[PDB]
Symmetry: C4
Subunit: 25 residues, 4 copies
């Protein structure tokens, strides 16, 4: 388990990557 | 809970994203 | 130890960096 | 505390940011 802040940051990071890929495609 | 280093990195990462968005807007 | 989500995010982040470097080289 | 992999990723992430800033300056 991780600090809730770190979990939040990790989710944002993944969603950032997904949105970027979808934008490029 | 997380290593303090990881908490620090996550905060920096979020603030990086926010500043980028504000810059673009 | 970390949340599995955070471990996943960290792996993706590293692989993102590696792919970027290989692309540039 | 965090998974060693996550600590590694966080260090790389910070160093990435620092190098980028120094490059721009
Ligand atoms: Ca932990
Ligand atoms: Ca806390
Ligand atoms: Ca430590
Ligand atoms: Ca969980
Ligand atoms: Ca482990
Ligand atoms: Cl963690």
């Amino acid at each position: 388990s991780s600090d809730p802040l770190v979990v939040a940051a990790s989710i944002i990071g993944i969603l950032h990557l997904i949105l970027w890929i979808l934008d490029r495609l």
